[PDB]
């Protein structure tokens, strides 16, 4: 009904925007060991 009961509020809300970031990486900044492709099989709808 439009009565101000002697109290005040501080509203807080949080948004979310889509960005476009810009990565940079120095030379030889990662050592990467690669294993060996192994194959496993299993059944499914219709086929293996």
């Amino acid at each position: 009904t439009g009565f101000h009961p002697g109290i005040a509020f501080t509203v807080v809300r949080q948004d979310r925007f889509a960005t476009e970031q810009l990565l940079y990486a120095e030379r030889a900044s990662e050592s990467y060991f690669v294993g060996q492709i192994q194959v496993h099989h299993h059944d499914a709808i219709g086929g293996v």
Binding site: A44, I45, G46, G47
Partner: protein, 48 residues
């Protein structure tokens, strides 16, 4: 459009077909009246 083959790809290996095993027609035996056994009774005579 149909994408539903997610490499699940069944019904890609059907080869049912229909075949026409031939045709068969007949002929009409053209009968000559003056070759009958009845033609002995009338004296046929063309008259243009």
């Amino acid at each position: 459009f149909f994408k539903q083959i997610r490499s699940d790809d069944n019904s890609l290996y059907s080869a049912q077909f229909d075949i026409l095993l031939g045709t068969y027609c007949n002929t009409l035996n053209f009968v000559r009246f003056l070759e009958l056994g009845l033609s002995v009774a009338c004296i046929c005579t063309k008259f243009p």
